[PDB]
């Protein structure tokens, strides 16, 4: 529940990291 | 000892909050609410930590509050590259914003983590 909301933050900051490569 | 797994997350809450307001600040590209992300991030990053002791006995405890903090630092050593009193690269720094921004969710994610197992 709350892991989860954390790992779609981590999940969001890696998925923009490539947006700038 | 430890932390109840409710209060770690509780803490989590206002970190990652702010994080992703530094992620939509980075995405909408102003560049000119890095600091004060920075700053709220880093007080909620304080905030959590107080959560365990200064010198925690556990290896995982020592080494995820290390990264922790020290993320929370490298962010707000980053962030503060946006104002020269005095040519800045947007392309590079914003790199090493989110970078440090996911350091500190990936070390908030492992104290809760090692603190779910002792509950």
Do not use: W
């Not at chain 2, 430890?2 to 209060?7: A, K, N, V």
């Not at chain 2, 600091?35 to 080494?63: D, G, N, Q």
């Amino acid at each position: 529940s709350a892991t989860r909301e954390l790992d779609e933050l981590m999940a969001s900051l890696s998925d923009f990291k490539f947006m700038a490569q | 000892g430890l932390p109840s797994t409710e209060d770690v997350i509780l803490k989590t809450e206002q970190v990652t909050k702010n994080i992703q307001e530094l992620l939509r600040a980075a995405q909408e590209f102003k560049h000119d609410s890095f600091v004060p992300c920075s700053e709220k991030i880093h007080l909620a990053v304080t905030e959590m930590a107080s959560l365990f002791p200064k010198r925690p006995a556990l290896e995982p405890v020592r080494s995820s509050l290390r990264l922790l903090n020290a993320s929370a630092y490298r962010l707000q050593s980053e962030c503060r590259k946006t104002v020269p009193p005095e040519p800045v690269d947007f392309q590079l720094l914003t790199q090493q914003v989110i970078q440090c921004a996911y350091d500190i969710a990936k070390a908030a994610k492992q104290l809760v983590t090692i603190t779910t197992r002792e509950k």
